[PDB]
mmCIF file of C-alpha atoms and ligand atoms in Angstrom:
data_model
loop_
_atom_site.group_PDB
_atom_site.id
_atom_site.type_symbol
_atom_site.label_atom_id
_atom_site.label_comp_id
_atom_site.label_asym_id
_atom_site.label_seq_id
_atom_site.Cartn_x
_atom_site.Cartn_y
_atom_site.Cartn_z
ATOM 1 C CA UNK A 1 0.000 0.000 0.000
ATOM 2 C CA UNK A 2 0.748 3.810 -0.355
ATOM 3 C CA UNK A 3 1.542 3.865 3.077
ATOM 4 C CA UNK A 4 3.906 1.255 3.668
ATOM 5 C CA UNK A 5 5.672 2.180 0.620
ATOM 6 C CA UNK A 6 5.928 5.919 2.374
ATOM 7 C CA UNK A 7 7.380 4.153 5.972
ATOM 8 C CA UNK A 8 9.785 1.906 3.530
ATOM 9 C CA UNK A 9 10.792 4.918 1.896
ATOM 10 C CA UNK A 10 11.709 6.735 5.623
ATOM 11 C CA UNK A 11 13.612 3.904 6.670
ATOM 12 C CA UNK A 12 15.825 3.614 3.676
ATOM 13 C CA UNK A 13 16.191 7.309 3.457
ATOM 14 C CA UNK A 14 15.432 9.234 6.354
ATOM 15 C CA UNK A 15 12.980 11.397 4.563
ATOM 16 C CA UNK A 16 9.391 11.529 4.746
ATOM 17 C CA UNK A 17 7.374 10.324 1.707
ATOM 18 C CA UNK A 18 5.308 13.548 1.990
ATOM 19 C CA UNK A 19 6.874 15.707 1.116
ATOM 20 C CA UNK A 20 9.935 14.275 -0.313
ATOM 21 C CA UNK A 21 8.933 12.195 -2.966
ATOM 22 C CA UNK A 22 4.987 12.774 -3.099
ATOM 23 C CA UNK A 23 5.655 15.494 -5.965
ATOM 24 C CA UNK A 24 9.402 15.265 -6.760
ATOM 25 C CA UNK A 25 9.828 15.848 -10.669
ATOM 26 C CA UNK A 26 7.576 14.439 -13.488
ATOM 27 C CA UNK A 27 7.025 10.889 -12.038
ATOM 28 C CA UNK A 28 7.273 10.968 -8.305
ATOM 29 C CA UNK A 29 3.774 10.711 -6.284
ATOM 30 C CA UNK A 30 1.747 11.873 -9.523
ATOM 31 C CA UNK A 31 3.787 10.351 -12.691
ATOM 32 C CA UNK A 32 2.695 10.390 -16.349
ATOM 33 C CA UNK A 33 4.879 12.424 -19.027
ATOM 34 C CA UNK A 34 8.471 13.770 -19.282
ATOM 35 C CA UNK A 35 12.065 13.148 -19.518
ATOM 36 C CA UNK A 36 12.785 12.064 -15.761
ATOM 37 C CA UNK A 37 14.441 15.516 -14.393
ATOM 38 C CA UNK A 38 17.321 12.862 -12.342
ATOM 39 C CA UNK A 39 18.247 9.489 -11.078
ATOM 40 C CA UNK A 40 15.664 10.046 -8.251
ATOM 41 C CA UNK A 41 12.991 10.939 -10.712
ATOM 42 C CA UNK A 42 14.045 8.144 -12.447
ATOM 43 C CA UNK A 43 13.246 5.873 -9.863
ATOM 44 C CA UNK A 44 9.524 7.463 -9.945
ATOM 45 C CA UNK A 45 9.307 6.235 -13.355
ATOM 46 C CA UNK A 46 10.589 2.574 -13.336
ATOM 47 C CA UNK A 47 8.267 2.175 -9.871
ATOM 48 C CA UNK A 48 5.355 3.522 -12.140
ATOM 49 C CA UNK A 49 6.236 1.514 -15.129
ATOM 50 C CA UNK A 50 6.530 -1.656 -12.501
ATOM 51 C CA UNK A 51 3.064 -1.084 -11.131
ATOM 52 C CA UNK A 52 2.299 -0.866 -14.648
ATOM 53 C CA UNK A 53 3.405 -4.124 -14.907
ATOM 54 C CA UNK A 54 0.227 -5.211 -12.431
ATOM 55 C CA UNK A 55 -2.709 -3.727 -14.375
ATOM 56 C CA UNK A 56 -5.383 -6.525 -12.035
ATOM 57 C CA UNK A 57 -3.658 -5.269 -8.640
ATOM 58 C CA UNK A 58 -3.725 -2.241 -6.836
ATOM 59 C CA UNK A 59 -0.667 -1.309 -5.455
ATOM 60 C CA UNK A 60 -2.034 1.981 -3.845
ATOM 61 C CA UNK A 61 -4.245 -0.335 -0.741
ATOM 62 C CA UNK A 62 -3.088 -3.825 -0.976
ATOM 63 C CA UNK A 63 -1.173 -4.454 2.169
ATOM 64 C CA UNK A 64 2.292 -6.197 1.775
ATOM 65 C CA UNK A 65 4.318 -7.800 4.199
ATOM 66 C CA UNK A 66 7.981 -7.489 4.589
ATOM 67 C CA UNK A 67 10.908 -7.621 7.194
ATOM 68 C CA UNK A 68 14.211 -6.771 7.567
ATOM 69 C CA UNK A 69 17.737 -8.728 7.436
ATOM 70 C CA UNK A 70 20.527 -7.220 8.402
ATOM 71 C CA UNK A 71 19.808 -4.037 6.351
ATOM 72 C CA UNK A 72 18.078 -5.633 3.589
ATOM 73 C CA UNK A 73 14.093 -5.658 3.051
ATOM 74 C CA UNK A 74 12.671 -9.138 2.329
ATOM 75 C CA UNK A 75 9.075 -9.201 0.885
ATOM 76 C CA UNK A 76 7.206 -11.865 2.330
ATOM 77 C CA UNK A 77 4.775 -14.232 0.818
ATOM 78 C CA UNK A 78 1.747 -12.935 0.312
ATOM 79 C CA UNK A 79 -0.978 -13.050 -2.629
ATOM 80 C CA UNK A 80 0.593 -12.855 -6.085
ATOM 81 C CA UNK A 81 -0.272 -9.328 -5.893
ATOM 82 C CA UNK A 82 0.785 -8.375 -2.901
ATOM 83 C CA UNK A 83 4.541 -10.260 -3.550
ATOM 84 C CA UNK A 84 4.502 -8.372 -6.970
ATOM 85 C CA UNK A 85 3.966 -4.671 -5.059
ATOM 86 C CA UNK A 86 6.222 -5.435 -2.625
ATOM 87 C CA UNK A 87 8.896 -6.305 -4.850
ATOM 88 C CA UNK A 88 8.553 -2.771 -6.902
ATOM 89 C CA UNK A 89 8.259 -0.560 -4.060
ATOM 90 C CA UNK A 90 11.571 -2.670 -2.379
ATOM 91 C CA UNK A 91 13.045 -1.552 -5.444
ATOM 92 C CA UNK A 92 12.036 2.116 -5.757
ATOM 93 C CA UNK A 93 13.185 2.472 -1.812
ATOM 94 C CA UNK A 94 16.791 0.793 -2.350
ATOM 95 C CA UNK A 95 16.973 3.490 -6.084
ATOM 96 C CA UNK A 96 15.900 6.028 -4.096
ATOM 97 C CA UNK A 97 18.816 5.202 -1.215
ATOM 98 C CA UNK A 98 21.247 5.163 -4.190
ATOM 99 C CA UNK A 99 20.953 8.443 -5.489
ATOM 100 C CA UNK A 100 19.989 10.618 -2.092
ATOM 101 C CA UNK A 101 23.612 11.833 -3.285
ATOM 102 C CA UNK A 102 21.918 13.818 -5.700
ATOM 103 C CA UNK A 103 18.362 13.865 -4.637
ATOM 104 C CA UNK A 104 17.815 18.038 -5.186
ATOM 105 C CA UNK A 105 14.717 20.392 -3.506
ATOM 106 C CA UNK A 106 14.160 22.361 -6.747
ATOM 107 C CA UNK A 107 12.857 18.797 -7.700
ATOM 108 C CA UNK A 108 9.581 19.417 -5.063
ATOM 109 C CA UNK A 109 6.302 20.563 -6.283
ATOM 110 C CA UNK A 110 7.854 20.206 -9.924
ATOM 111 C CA UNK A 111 5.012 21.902 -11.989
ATOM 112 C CA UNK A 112 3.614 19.518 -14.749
ATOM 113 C CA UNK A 113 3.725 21.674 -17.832
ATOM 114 C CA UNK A 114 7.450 21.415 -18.027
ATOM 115 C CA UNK A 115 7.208 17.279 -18.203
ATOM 116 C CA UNK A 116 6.323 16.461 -21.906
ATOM 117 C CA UNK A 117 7.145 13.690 -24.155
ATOM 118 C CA UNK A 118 6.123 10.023 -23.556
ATOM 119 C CA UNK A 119 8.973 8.065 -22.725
ATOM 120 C CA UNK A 120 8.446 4.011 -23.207
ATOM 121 C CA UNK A 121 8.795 1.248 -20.380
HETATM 122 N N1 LIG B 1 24.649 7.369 -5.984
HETATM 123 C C1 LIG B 1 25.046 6.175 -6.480
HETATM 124 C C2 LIG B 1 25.289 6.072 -7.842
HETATM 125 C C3 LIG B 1 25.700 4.874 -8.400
HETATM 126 C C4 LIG B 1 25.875 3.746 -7.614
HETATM 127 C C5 LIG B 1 26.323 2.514 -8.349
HETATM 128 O O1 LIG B 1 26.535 1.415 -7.858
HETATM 129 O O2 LIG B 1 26.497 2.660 -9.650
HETATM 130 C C6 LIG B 1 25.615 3.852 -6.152
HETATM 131 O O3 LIG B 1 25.764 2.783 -5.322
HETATM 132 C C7 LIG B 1 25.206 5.079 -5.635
#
């Protein structure tokens, strides 16, 4: 669900999910069109391009389960669904750890006009 996905997000990173990454660029929180403005952005689109891998789940209030070990999140076994989710929200959380090194805050409350252009999965 949207909020696990917002505590995973915390843990990895240390920031909140709102605001942080509920409006970052053109595909973080709201997605759809544009050349991702950086590697965090980025990350926004592959997550929506894996949900749009799942077009008979719902990603936004299907619970998941997962724990930790060591560091590491492990996505336990759930409905095919809920496994699926889980494994593309992991995967966002661990991108967006990766490139906090350049996450930037002129990314927030990026307005949608300047995103234009599909760009494929
Ligand atoms: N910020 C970054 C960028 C690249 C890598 C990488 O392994 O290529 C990383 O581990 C962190």
């Amino acid at each position: 669900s949207l909020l696990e996905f917002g505590k995973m997000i915390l843990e990895e990173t240390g920031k909140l999910a709102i605001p942080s990454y509920s409006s970052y660029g053109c595909y973080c929180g709201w997605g759809g069109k544009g050349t991702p403005k950086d590697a965090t952005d980025r990350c926004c689109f592959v997550h929506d391009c894996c949900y749009g891998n799942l077009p008979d789940c719902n990603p936004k209030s299907d619970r998941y389960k997962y724990k930790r070990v060591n560091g590491a999140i492990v996505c336990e076994k759930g409905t095919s669904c809920e496994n699926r989710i889980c494994e593309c929200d992991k995967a966002a959380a661990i991108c967006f750890r990766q490139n906090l090194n350049t996450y930037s805050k002129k990314y927030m409350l990026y307005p949608d006009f300047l995103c234009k252009g599909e760009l494929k999965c």
